[PDB]
Amino acid sequence: LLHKRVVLASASPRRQEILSNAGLRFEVVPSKFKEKLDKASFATPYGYAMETAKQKALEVANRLYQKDLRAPDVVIGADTIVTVGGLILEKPVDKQDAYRMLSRLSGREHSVFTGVAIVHCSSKDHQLDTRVSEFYEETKVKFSELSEELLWEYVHSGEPMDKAGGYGIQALGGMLVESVHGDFLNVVGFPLNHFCKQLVKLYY
Amino acid sequence: LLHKRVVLASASPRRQEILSNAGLRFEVVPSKFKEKLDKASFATPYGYAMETAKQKALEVANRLYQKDLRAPDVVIGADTIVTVGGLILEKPVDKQDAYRMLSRLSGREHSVFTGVAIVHCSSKDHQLDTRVSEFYEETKVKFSELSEELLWEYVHSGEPMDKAGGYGIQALGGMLVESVHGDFLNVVGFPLNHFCKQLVKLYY
């Protein structure tokens, strides 16, 4: 992945930071996948995440190809979701939808699923051929019993309006997050360790 | 804390970064108390950490009092340590000390204990009254199998010098930490969520 053209199919700054801190240089081409699938049409939440990440990356690969006629070597997609008692929580639409989210996470242990898709692209016969490997990572996260005192002061953050489930763990999330169990970078947005473990089995 | 002067008794920036990111402002006054507490004088490693945090905070309370004789209202002391199968790891001495720490932490699971002391002071009647509350938080942390010359590179960066166990949480872009179990702000240096839980207990 030194010589290979790598692009990242997300505009999330926290994913960029994780990958760039790891030494990987990549282009950032956010995906135009405005569509989002049906959650009930999947067996498991991480299945819905791995597919949403697949479509994000394939939208980027088929847009770069049919516009530059360049097939990027690798396209990376990712989708981070949250589940509470089975119900799937994506990212909020307005500030008080964060409340409806945050009020449900409160006092409870939930899962963070991030499905990743590594799309290897090659061009032949004016067609973009795609070989896509998918995987996911789960991290359990416990929220302390949250009063609405810290709830509104935490929606007034402006912080949760982009995150999955309406929360982060580093800035102001410290009062929210009692404990996490599993890959912690997966909570922040990208399961970096599992991602580097994957690549070596596709190559070797 | 709405009307009182707060003092933090440590020079580590990530402790300061955490608490100010929590919306609490204060003043940084490091402690002149060496961590020469005899470890055999304790039964548990967290008892040692709490006692060390107490003395650090108490020294700052005294020095700020034997100077101005206007006792700051609450002074916070913290001590973070790492344990690997009973062995206590603290801040490294040289680079060889920082190197051996991580390569023993290699691929193994260890415990991170941070002990916190909240010292309440009162000086109205020409003398210092100090009432302290101590507590700790433990997080288990597993490291991945990473080669020696690569974490010998992490030692050359200067990052291991100020950290318990000789590592921060974004070490090697985040590939040194495979998993965490517990509060992760406890790992970087300060158990904010537990500290907030305590602060409301001291009062109401």
mmCIF file of C-alpha atoms in Angstrom:
data_model
loop_
_atom_site.group_PDB
_atom_site.id
_atom_site.type_symbol
_atom_site.label_atom_id
_atom_site.label_comp_id
_atom_site.label_asym_id
_atom_site.label_seq_id
_atom_site.Cartn_x
_atom_site.Cartn_y
_atom_site.Cartn_z
ATOM 1 C CA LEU A 1 0.000 0.000 0.000
ATOM 2 C CA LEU A 2 3.040 2.198 -0.487
ATOM 3 C CA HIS A 3 2.881 2.497 -4.282
ATOM 4 C CA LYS A 4 -0.864 1.838 -4.478
ATOM 5 C CA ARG A 5 -3.281 4.723 -4.927
ATOM 6 C CA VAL A 6 -5.308 4.659 -1.699
ATOM 7 C CA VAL A 7 -8.357 6.853 -1.174
ATOM 8 C CA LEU A 8 -10.685 7.117 1.812
ATOM 9 C CA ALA A 9 -14.429 7.289 1.120
ATOM 10 C CA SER A 10 -15.340 9.336 4.223
ATOM 11 C CA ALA A 11 -15.399 13.027 5.100
ATOM 12 C CA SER A 12 -15.156 12.222 8.808
ATOM 13 C CA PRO A 13 -12.116 14.060 10.217
ATOM 14 C CA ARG A 14 -11.633 11.454 12.948
ATOM 15 C CA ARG A 15 -11.172 8.661 10.386
ATOM 16 C CA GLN A 16 -8.646 10.757 8.456
ATOM 17 C CA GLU A 17 -6.700 11.413 11.662
ATOM 18 C CA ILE A 18 -6.600 7.758 12.727
ATOM 19 C CA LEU A 19 -5.365 6.584 9.329
ATOM 20 C CA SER A 20 -2.878 9.421 8.838
ATOM 21 C CA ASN A 21 -1.531 8.981 12.378
ATOM 22 C CA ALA A 22 -0.892 5.345 11.371
ATOM 23 C CA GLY A 23 1.388 6.519 8.544
ATOM 24 C CA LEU A 24 -1.030 5.706 5.707
ATOM 25 C CA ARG A 25 -1.283 8.440 3.078
ATOM 26 C CA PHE A 26 -4.503 8.497 1.084
ATOM 27 C CA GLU A 27 -6.794 10.840 -0.772
ATOM 28 C CA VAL A 28 -10.092 11.892 0.778
ATOM 29 C CA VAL A 29 -13.001 11.553 -1.636
ATOM 30 C CA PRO A 30 -16.283 11.643 0.313
ATOM 31 C CA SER A 31 -19.012 9.358 -1.015
ATOM 32 C CA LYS A 32 -22.165 10.622 -2.749
ATOM 33 C CA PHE A 33 -24.111 7.614 -1.362
ATOM 34 C CA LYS A 34 -27.043 9.735 -0.152
ATOM 35 C CA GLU A 35 -29.156 6.583 -0.246
ATOM 36 C CA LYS A 36 -29.104 4.510 2.930
ATOM 37 C CA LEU A 37 -30.465 0.975 2.996
ATOM 38 C CA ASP A 38 -33.145 -0.662 5.155
ATOM 39 C CA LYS A 39 -31.937 -1.959 8.517
ATOM 40 C CA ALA A 40 -34.628 -4.656 8.742
ATOM 41 C CA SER A 41 -33.377 -6.255 5.507
ATOM 42 C CA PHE A 42 -30.186 -7.471 7.230
ATOM 43 C CA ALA A 43 -29.655 -10.351 9.632
ATOM 44 C CA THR A 44 -27.206 -8.532 11.925
ATOM 45 C CA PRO A 45 -26.346 -4.855 12.524
ATOM 46 C CA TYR A 46 -22.694 -5.298 11.535
ATOM 47 C CA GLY A 47 -24.049 -6.766 8.306
ATOM 48 C CA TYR A 48 -25.916 -3.518 7.628
ATOM 49 C CA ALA A 49 -22.731 -1.621 8.481
ATOM 50 C CA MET A 50 -20.481 -3.711 6.234
ATOM 51 C CA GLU A 51 -22.885 -3.283 3.314
ATOM 52 C CA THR A 52 -23.287 0.470 3.826
ATOM 53 C CA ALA A 53 -19.490 0.718 3.806
ATOM 54 C CA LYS A 54 -19.358 -1.434 0.665
ATOM 55 C CA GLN A 55 -21.761 0.851 -1.209
ATOM 56 C CA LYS A 56 -19.954 3.978 0.002
ATOM 57 C CA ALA A 57 -16.630 2.766 -1.398
ATOM 58 C CA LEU A 58 -18.086 1.405 -4.654
ATOM 59 C CA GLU A 59 -19.875 4.708 -5.284
ATOM 60 C CA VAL A 60 -16.482 6.406 -4.959
ATOM 61 C CA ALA A 61 -14.651 3.904 -7.172
ATOM 62 C CA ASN A 62 -17.265 4.027 -9.938
ATOM 63 C CA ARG A 63 -17.330 7.836 -9.798
ATOM 64 C CA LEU A 64 -13.557 8.296 -9.998
ATOM 65 C CA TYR A 65 -13.361 5.721 -12.791
ATOM 66 C CA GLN A 66 -16.242 6.960 -14.933
ATOM 67 C CA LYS A 67 -14.852 10.572 -14.558
ATOM 68 C CA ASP A 68 -11.051 10.194 -14.641
ATOM 69 C CA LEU A 69 -10.904 6.767 -16.345
ATOM 70 C CA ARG A 70 -8.457 5.932 -13.539
ATOM 71 C CA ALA A 71 -9.161 2.881 -11.412
ATOM 72 C CA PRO A 72 -7.775 3.696 -7.945
ATOM 73 C CA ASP A 73 -5.783 0.820 -6.503
ATOM 74 C CA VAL A 74 -7.678 0.628 -3.190
ATOM 75 C CA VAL A 75 -10.874 2.314 -1.972
ATOM 76 C CA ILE A 76 -11.705 2.154 1.746
ATOM 77 C CA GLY A 77 -15.237 2.528 3.070
ATOM 78 C CA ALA A 78 -16.517 2.502 6.634
ATOM 79 C CA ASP A 79 -19.794 2.928 8.485
ATOM 80 C CA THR A 80 -20.015 3.308 12.254
ATOM 81 C CA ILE A 81 -23.323 2.481 13.941
ATOM 82 C CA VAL A 82 -24.518 1.943 17.514
ATOM 83 C CA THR A 83 -27.006 -0.639 18.859
ATOM 84 C CA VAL A 84 -29.027 -0.457 22.110
ATOM 85 C CA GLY A 85 -31.081 -3.557 22.847
ATOM 86 C CA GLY A 86 -30.946 -4.490 19.165
ATOM 87 C CA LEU A 87 -32.223 -1.140 17.884
ATOM 88 C CA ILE A 88 -29.798 0.452 15.408
ATOM 89 C CA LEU A 89 -28.714 4.051 16.093
ATOM 90 C CA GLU A 90 -27.028 5.925 13.244
ATOM 91 C CA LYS A 91 -26.032 9.541 13.267
ATOM 92 C CA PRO A 92 -28.495 12.214 14.422
ATOM 93 C CA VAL A 93 -30.511 14.614 12.314
ATOM 94 C CA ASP A 94 -31.136 17.449 14.799
ATOM 95 C CA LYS A 95 -29.998 18.281 18.317
ATOM 96 C CA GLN A 96 -33.001 16.844 20.089
ATOM 97 C CA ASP A 97 -32.663 13.591 18.126
ATOM 98 C CA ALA A 98 -29.358 13.265 19.944
ATOM 99 C CA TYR A 99 -31.368 13.506 23.181
ATOM 100 C CA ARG A 100 -33.648 10.694 21.993
ATOM 101 C CA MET A 101 -30.413 8.806 21.299
ATOM 102 C CA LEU A 102 -28.399 9.884 24.352
ATOM 103 C CA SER A 103 -31.363 9.339 26.671
ATOM 104 C CA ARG A 104 -31.473 5.700 25.516
ATOM 105 C CA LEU A 105 -27.725 5.027 25.827
ATOM 106 C CA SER A 106 -27.893 6.402 29.380
ATOM 107 C CA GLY A 107 -27.193 4.003 32.222
ATOM 108 C CA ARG A 108 -26.833 1.169 29.733
ATOM 109 C CA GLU A 109 -24.206 -0.848 27.891
ATOM 110 C CA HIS A 110 -24.319 -0.716 24.076
ATOM 111 C CA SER A 111 -22.291 -1.880 21.076
ATOM 112 C CA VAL A 112 -20.291 0.147 18.562
ATOM 113 C CA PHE A 113 -20.080 -1.560 15.158
ATOM 114 C CA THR A 114 -17.859 -0.239 12.384
ATOM 115 C CA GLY A 115 -17.955 -2.259 9.177
ATOM 116 C CA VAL A 116 -15.088 -1.646 6.767
ATOM 117 C CA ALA A 117 -14.781 -2.524 3.071
ATOM 118 C CA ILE A 118 -11.431 -2.702 1.259
ATOM 119 C CA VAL A 119 -12.220 -2.442 -2.465
ATOM 120 C CA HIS A 120 -9.418 -3.485 -4.829
ATOM 121 C CA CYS A 121 -10.129 -1.960 -8.251
ATOM 122 C CA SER A 122 -8.674 -2.760 -11.648
ATOM 123 C CA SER A 123 -9.740 -1.583 -15.091
ATOM 124 C CA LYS A 124 -9.977 -3.880 -18.092
ATOM 125 C CA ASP A 125 -12.107 -3.693 -21.252
ATOM 126 C CA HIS A 126 -13.481 -0.252 -20.330
ATOM 127 C CA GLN A 127 -15.005 -1.775 -17.192
ATOM 128 C CA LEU A 128 -14.140 -1.257 -13.533
ATOM 129 C CA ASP A 129 -13.749 -4.692 -11.945
ATOM 130 C CA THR A 130 -14.089 -4.770 -8.154
ATOM 131 C CA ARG A 131 -12.751 -7.257 -5.593
ATOM 132 C CA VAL A 132 -14.072 -6.207 -2.185
ATOM 133 C CA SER A 133 -13.232 -7.731 1.197
ATOM 134 C CA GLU A 134 -15.370 -6.714 4.177
ATOM 135 C CA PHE A 135 -14.976 -6.966 7.945
ATOM 136 C CA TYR A 136 -16.236 -5.327 11.116
ATOM 137 C CA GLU A 137 -15.273 -4.594 14.708
ATOM 138 C CA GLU A 138 -17.381 -4.499 17.858
ATOM 139 C CA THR A 139 -16.642 -2.514 21.005
ATOM 140 C CA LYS A 140 -18.894 -2.432 24.053
ATOM 141 C CA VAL A 141 -19.455 0.960 25.683
ATOM 142 C CA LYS A 142 -21.147 1.728 29.013
ATOM 143 C CA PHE A 143 -22.793 5.102 29.710
ATOM 144 C CA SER A 144 -23.070 6.191 33.340
ATOM 145 C CA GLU A 145 -26.593 6.980 34.567
ATOM 146 C CA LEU A 146 -27.007 10.303 32.798
ATOM 147 C CA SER A 147 -29.091 13.042 34.317
ATOM 148 C CA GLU A 148 -30.733 15.506 31.970
ATOM 149 C CA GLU A 149 -28.589 18.177 33.647
ATOM 150 C CA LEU A 150 -25.518 16.908 31.794
ATOM 151 C CA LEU A 151 -27.730 15.754 28.890
ATOM 152 C CA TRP A 152 -28.732 19.194 27.602
ATOM 153 C CA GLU A 153 -25.365 20.740 28.471
ATOM 154 C CA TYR A 154 -24.019 17.876 26.334
ATOM 155 C CA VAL A 155 -26.412 18.496 23.450
ATOM 156 C CA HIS A 156 -25.497 22.182 23.686
ATOM 157 C CA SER A 157 -21.996 20.852 22.908
ATOM 158 C CA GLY A 158 -22.595 20.901 19.181
ATOM 159 C CA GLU A 159 -20.272 17.910 19.545
ATOM 160 C CA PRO A 160 -22.761 15.025 19.051
ATOM 161 C CA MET A 161 -24.397 16.294 15.819
ATOM 162 C CA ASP A 162 -22.010 14.322 13.588
ATOM 163 C CA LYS A 163 -21.027 11.261 15.649
ATOM 164 C CA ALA A 164 -22.641 7.828 15.558
ATOM 165 C CA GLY A 165 -25.204 7.616 18.330
ATOM 166 C CA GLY A 166 -24.520 11.281 19.090
ATOM 167 C CA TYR A 167 -21.387 10.985 21.220
ATOM 168 C CA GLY A 168 -17.616 10.863 21.226
ATOM 169 C CA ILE A 169 -15.246 9.682 23.938
ATOM 170 C CA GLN A 170 -12.414 12.260 24.048
ATOM 171 C CA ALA A 171 -13.909 15.763 24.417
ATOM 172 C CA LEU A 172 -16.844 16.120 26.853
ATOM 173 C CA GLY A 173 -17.578 12.416 26.344
ATOM 174 C CA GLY A 174 -15.518 11.696 29.459
ATOM 175 C CA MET A 175 -18.501 12.483 31.671
ATOM 176 C CA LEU A 176 -20.693 10.388 29.349
ATOM 177 C CA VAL A 177 -18.486 7.312 28.988
ATOM 178 C CA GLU A 178 -18.110 5.166 32.092
ATOM 179 C CA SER A 179 -16.108 2.411 30.374
ATOM 180 C CA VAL A 180 -15.404 0.792 27.011
ATOM 181 C CA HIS A 181 -14.616 -2.848 26.252
ATOM 182 C CA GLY A 182 -12.783 -3.830 23.074
ATOM 183 C CA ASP A 183 -10.947 -1.905 20.359
ATOM 184 C CA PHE A 184 -11.051 1.714 21.477
ATOM 185 C CA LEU A 185 -10.129 3.257 18.109
ATOM 186 C CA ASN A 186 -13.195 1.439 16.774
ATOM 187 C CA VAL A 187 -15.308 3.627 19.080
ATOM 188 C CA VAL A 188 -13.690 6.808 17.743
ATOM 189 C CA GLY A 189 -14.531 5.810 14.165
ATOM 190 C CA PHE A 190 -12.062 3.359 12.622
ATOM 191 C CA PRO A 191 -10.928 -0.117 13.830
ATOM 192 C CA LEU A 192 -7.311 0.533 12.962
ATOM 193 C CA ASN A 193 -5.703 -2.592 14.444
ATOM 194 C CA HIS A 194 -8.187 -4.973 12.818
ATOM 195 C CA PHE A 195 -7.762 -3.059 9.550
ATOM 196 C CA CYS A 196 -3.988 -3.596 9.507
ATOM 197 C CA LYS A 197 -4.450 -7.251 10.483
ATOM 198 C CA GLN A 198 -6.767 -7.740 7.494
ATOM 199 C CA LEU A 199 -4.464 -6.350 4.789
ATOM 200 C CA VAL A 200 -1.658 -8.842 5.457
ATOM 201 C CA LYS A 201 -3.932 -11.839 4.750
ATOM 202 C CA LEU A 202 -5.135 -10.309 1.482
ATOM 203 C CA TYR A 203 -1.488 -9.793 0.472
ATOM 204 C CA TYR A 204 0.240 -12.809 2.030
ATOM 205 C CA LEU B 1 -16.825 24.592 42.094
ATOM 206 C CA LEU B 2 -19.084 27.411 40.939
ATOM 207 C CA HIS B 3 -17.300 30.041 43.073
ATOM 208 C CA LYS B 4 -14.053 28.389 44.251
ATOM 209 C CA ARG B 5 -10.399 28.305 43.178
ATOM 210 C CA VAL B 6 -9.307 24.865 41.945
ATOM 211 C CA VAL B 7 -5.672 23.726 41.716
ATOM 212 C CA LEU B 8 -4.306 20.686 39.860
ATOM 213 C CA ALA B 9 -1.077 19.291 41.323
ATOM 214 C CA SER B 10 0.559 17.687 38.254
ATOM 215 C CA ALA B 11 2.663 18.893 35.328
ATOM 216 C CA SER B 12 1.377 16.355 32.785
ATOM 217 C CA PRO B 13 -0.451 18.156 29.931
ATOM 218 C CA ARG B 14 -2.945 15.321 29.194
ATOM 219 C CA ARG B 15 -4.327 15.614 32.709
ATOM 220 C CA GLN B 16 -4.742 19.343 32.068
ATOM 221 C CA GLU B 17 -6.149 18.703 28.592
ATOM 222 C CA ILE B 18 -8.766 16.323 30.038
ATOM 223 C CA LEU B 19 -10.026 18.553 32.849
ATOM 224 C CA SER B 20 -10.266 21.711 30.737
ATOM 225 C CA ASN B 21 -11.975 19.686 27.990
ATOM 226 C CA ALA B 22 -14.493 18.777 30.722
ATOM 227 C CA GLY B 23 -15.433 22.451 31.023
ATOM 228 C CA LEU B 24 -13.732 22.807 34.417
ATOM 229 C CA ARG B 25 -11.167 25.583 34.741
ATOM 230 C CA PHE B 26 -8.511 25.741 37.422
ATOM 231 C CA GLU B 27 -4.787 26.449 37.756
ATOM 232 C CA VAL B 28 -1.793 24.175 37.207
ATOM 233 C CA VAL B 29 0.625 24.059 40.141
ATOM 234 C CA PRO B 30 2.857 20.945 40.016
ATOM 235 C CA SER B 31 3.900 19.158 43.196
ATOM 236 C CA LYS B 32 7.434 19.070 44.600
ATOM 237 C CA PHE B 33 6.814 15.731 46.368
ATOM 238 C CA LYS B 34 8.949 12.899 45.013
ATOM 239 C CA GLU B 35 7.275 9.534 44.453
ATOM 240 C CA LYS B 36 9.656 7.721 46.803
ATOM 241 C CA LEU B 37 6.886 5.917 48.703
ATOM 242 C CA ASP B 38 8.019 2.415 49.668
ATOM 243 C CA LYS B 39 5.850 0.008 47.686
ATOM 244 C CA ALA B 40 6.144 -2.803 50.252
ATOM 245 C CA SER B 41 4.435 -0.512 52.793
ATOM 246 C CA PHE B 42 1.176 -1.256 50.912
ATOM 247 C CA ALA B 43 -0.870 -4.364 50.188
ATOM 248 C CA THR B 44 -2.423 -3.250 46.890
ATOM 249 C CA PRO B 45 -0.989 -1.179 44.022
ATOM 250 C CA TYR B 46 -3.986 1.165 44.042
ATOM 251 C CA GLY B 47 -3.451 1.876 47.732
ATOM 252 C CA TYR B 48 0.056 3.004 46.799
ATOM 253 C CA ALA B 49 -1.253 5.167 43.957
ATOM 254 C CA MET B 50 -3.912 6.849 46.098
ATOM 255 C CA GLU B 51 -1.441 7.568 48.901
ATOM 256 C CA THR B 52 1.018 9.078 46.411
ATOM 257 C CA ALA B 53 -1.691 11.267 44.871
ATOM 258 C CA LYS B 54 -2.642 12.433 48.373
ATOM 259 C CA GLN B 55 0.873 13.536 49.338
ATOM 260 C CA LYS B 56 1.335 15.325 45.994
ATOM 261 C CA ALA B 57 -1.905 17.257 46.524
ATOM 262 C CA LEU B 58 -1.138 17.885 50.196
ATOM 263 C CA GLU B 59 2.268 19.382 49.384
ATOM 264 C CA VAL B 60 0.702 21.852 46.946
ATOM 265 C CA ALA B 61 -1.941 22.726 49.546
ATOM 266 C CA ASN B 62 0.821 23.357 52.093
ATOM 267 C CA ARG B 63 3.128 25.300 49.772
ATOM 268 C CA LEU B 64 0.231 27.453 48.563
ATOM 269 C CA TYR B 65 -0.747 27.947 52.221
ATOM 270 C CA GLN B 66 2.659 28.512 53.816
ATOM 271 C CA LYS B 67 3.126 31.244 51.164
ATOM 272 C CA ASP B 68 -0.075 33.280 50.951
ATOM 273 C CA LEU B 69 -1.796 31.689 53.987
ATOM 274 C CA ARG B 70 -4.920 31.950 51.763
ATOM 275 C CA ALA B 71 -5.627 28.275 51.232
ATOM 276 C CA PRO B 72 -6.890 27.352 47.762
ATOM 277 C CA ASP B 73 -10.271 25.745 48.154
ATOM 278 C CA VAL B 74 -9.698 22.320 46.545
ATOM 279 C CA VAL B 75 -6.414 20.857 45.223
ATOM 280 C CA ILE B 76 -6.401 17.722 43.033
ATOM 281 C CA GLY B 77 -3.583 15.165 43.058
ATOM 282 C CA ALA B 78 -3.300 12.168 40.745
ATOM 283 C CA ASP B 79 -0.900 9.253 40.349
ATOM 284 C CA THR B 80 -1.066 6.829 37.405
ATOM 285 C CA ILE B 81 0.775 3.492 37.537
ATOM 286 C CA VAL B 82 0.951 0.349 35.397
ATOM 287 C CA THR B 83 1.007 -3.214 36.746
ATOM 288 C CA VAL B 84 2.118 -6.339 34.852
ATOM 289 C CA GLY B 85 1.668 -9.508 36.901
ATOM 290 C CA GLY B 86 2.224 -7.725 40.199
ATOM 291 C CA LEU B 87 5.131 -5.590 38.955
ATOM 292 C CA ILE B 88 4.571 -1.839 39.269
ATOM 293 C CA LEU B 89 5.561 0.345 36.312
ATOM 294 C CA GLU B 90 5.657 4.128 36.670
ATOM 295 C CA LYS B 91 7.304 6.959 34.740
ATOM 296 C CA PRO B 92 10.488 5.893 32.910
ATOM 297 C CA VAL B 93 13.993 6.902 33.953
ATOM 298 C CA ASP B 94 15.958 6.762 30.701
ATOM 299 C CA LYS B 95 15.198 5.423 27.223
ATOM 300 C CA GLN B 96 16.449 1.948 28.123
ATOM 301 C CA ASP B 97 13.940 2.085 30.995
ATOM 302 C CA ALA B 98 11.206 3.230 28.609
ATOM 303 C CA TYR B 99 12.213 0.587 26.063
ATOM 304 C CA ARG B 100 12.159 -2.345 28.502
ATOM 305 C CA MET B 101 8.762 -1.249 29.835
ATOM 306 C CA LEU B 102 6.997 -1.513 26.470
ATOM 307 C CA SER B 103 8.751 -4.731 25.345
ATOM 308 C CA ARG B 104 7.649 -6.402 28.576
ATOM 309 C CA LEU B 105 4.191 -4.940 27.983
ATOM 310 C CA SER B 106 4.478 -6.547 24.594
ATOM 311 C CA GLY B 107 1.562 -8.688 23.536
ATOM 312 C CA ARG B 108 0.542 -8.988 27.198
ATOM 313 C CA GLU B 109 -2.377 -7.547 29.154
ATOM 314 C CA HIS B 110 -1.614 -5.116 31.995
ATOM 315 C CA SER B 111 -3.574 -2.977 34.454
ATOM 316 C CA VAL B 112 -3.598 0.816 34.665
ATOM 317 C CA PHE B 113 -4.418 2.317 38.065
ATOM 318 C CA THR B 114 -4.911 6.035 38.612
ATOM 319 C CA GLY B 115 -5.396 7.189 42.192
ATOM 320 C CA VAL B 116 -6.955 10.601 42.766
ATOM 321 C CA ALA B 117 -6.973 12.785 45.888
ATOM 322 C CA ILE B 118 -9.428 15.660 46.289
ATOM 323 C CA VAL B 119 -8.207 17.884 49.119
ATOM 324 C CA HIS B 120 -10.695 20.379 50.561
ATOM 325 C CA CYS B 121 -9.037 23.293 52.351
ATOM 326 C CA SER B 122 -10.209 26.008 54.726
ATOM 327 C CA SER B 123 -8.096 28.804 56.219
ATOM 328 C CA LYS B 124 -10.617 31.261 57.646
ATOM 329 C CA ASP B 125 -9.293 31.185 61.194
ATOM 330 C CA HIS B 126 -5.564 31.626 60.428
ATOM 331 C CA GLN B 127 -4.940 27.876 60.017
ATOM 332 C CA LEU B 128 -5.318 25.243 57.304
ATOM 333 C CA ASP B 129 -8.024 22.583 57.617
ATOM 334 C CA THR B 130 -7.689 19.771 55.061
ATOM 335 C CA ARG B 131 -10.319 17.082 54.425
ATOM 336 C CA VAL B 132 -9.371 14.620 51.696
ATOM 337 C CA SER B 133 -11.286 12.022 49.708
ATOM 338 C CA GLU B 134 -9.330 9.380 47.798
ATOM 339 C CA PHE B 135 -10.427 6.940 45.109
ATOM 340 C CA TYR B 136 -9.001 5.051 42.150
ATOM 341 C CA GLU B 137 -9.982 3.501 38.834
ATOM 342 C CA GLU B 138 -8.474 0.513 37.050
ATOM 343 C CA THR B 139 -8.410 -0.250 33.335
ATOM 344 C CA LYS B 140 -7.044 -3.419 31.762
ATOM 345 C CA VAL B 141 -5.152 -2.848 28.507
ATOM 346 C CA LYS B 142 -3.811 -5.396 26.013
ATOM 347 C CA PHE B 143 -0.902 -4.637 23.684
ATOM 348 C CA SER B 144 -0.416 -6.125 20.233
ATOM 349 C CA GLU B 145 2.615 -8.111 19.078
ATOM 350 C CA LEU B 146 4.757 -5.352 17.552
ATOM 351 C CA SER B 147 8.425 -5.675 16.572
ATOM 352 C CA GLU B 148 11.207 -4.267 18.726
ATOM 353 C CA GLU B 149 12.847 -1.861 16.320
ATOM 354 C CA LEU B 150 9.461 -0.209 15.758
ATOM 355 C CA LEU B 151 8.755 0.442 19.435
ATOM 356 C CA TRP B 152 12.432 1.311 19.846
ATOM 357 C CA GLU B 153 11.524 4.022 17.341
ATOM 358 C CA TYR B 154 8.610 5.081 19.560
ATOM 359 C CA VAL B 155 11.107 5.525 22.406
ATOM 360 C CA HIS B 156 13.285 7.804 20.248
ATOM 361 C CA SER B 157 10.306 10.150 19.759
ATOM 362 C CA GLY B 158 10.336 11.204 23.425
ATOM 363 C CA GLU B 159 6.712 10.175 23.962
ATOM 364 C CA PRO B 160 7.388 7.450 26.606
ATOM 365 C CA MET B 161 9.239 9.867 28.893
ATOM 366 C CA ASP B 162 6.320 11.337 30.868
ATOM 367 C CA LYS B 163 3.832 8.440 30.734
ATOM 368 C CA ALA B 164 3.144 5.635 33.191
ATOM 369 C CA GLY B 165 4.392 2.445 31.596
ATOM 370 C CA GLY B 166 6.137 4.635 29.009
ATOM 371 C CA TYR B 167 3.226 4.949 26.584
ATOM 372 C CA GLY B 168 0.346 7.192 25.610
ATOM 373 C CA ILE B 169 -2.916 6.002 24.115
ATOM 374 C CA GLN B 170 -2.125 7.266 20.593
ATOM 375 C CA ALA B 171 1.226 5.452 20.611
ATOM 376 C CA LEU B 172 2.318 4.314 17.139
ATOM 377 C CA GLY B 173 -0.782 5.974 15.701
ATOM 378 C CA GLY B 174 -2.822 3.670 17.919
ATOM 379 C CA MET B 175 -1.508 0.202 16.985
ATOM 380 C CA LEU B 176 0.217 -0.433 20.306
ATOM 381 C CA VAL B 177 -3.138 -0.745 22.112
ATOM 382 C CA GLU B 178 -5.158 -3.774 21.029
ATOM 383 C CA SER B 179 -7.928 -3.571 23.630
ATOM 384 C CA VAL B 180 -9.002 -1.633 26.713
ATOM 385 C CA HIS B 181 -11.461 -2.731 29.407
ATOM 386 C CA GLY B 182 -12.664 0.015 31.728
ATOM 387 C CA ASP B 183 -12.438 3.799 31.619
ATOM 388 C CA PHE B 184 -10.026 4.821 28.890
ATOM 389 C CA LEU B 185 -9.473 8.362 30.153
ATOM 390 C CA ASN B 186 -8.068 6.447 33.130
ATOM 391 C CA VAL B 187 -5.425 5.097 30.747
ATOM 392 C CA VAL B 188 -4.296 8.457 29.364
ATOM 393 C CA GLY B 189 -3.903 9.734 32.915
ATOM 394 C CA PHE B 190 -7.061 10.871 34.670
ATOM 395 C CA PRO B 191 -10.312 9.022 35.452
ATOM 396 C CA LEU B 192 -12.617 11.920 34.610
ATOM 397 C CA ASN B 193 -15.898 9.992 34.786
ATOM 398 C CA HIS B 194 -15.136 8.659 38.268
ATOM 399 C CA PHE B 195 -13.868 12.093 39.333
ATOM 400 C CA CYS B 196 -17.238 13.567 38.334
ATOM 401 C CA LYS B 197 -19.073 10.832 40.246
ATOM 402 C CA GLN B 198 -17.034 11.666 43.347
ATOM 403 C CA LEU B 199 -17.462 15.443 43.054
ATOM 404 C CA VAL B 200 -21.237 15.150 43.383
ATOM 405 C CA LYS B 201 -20.799 12.794 46.361
ATOM 406 C CA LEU B 202 -18.586 15.262 48.257
ATOM 407 C CA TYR B 203 -21.435 17.792 48.054
ATOM 408 C CA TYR B 204 -24.965 16.362 47.882
#
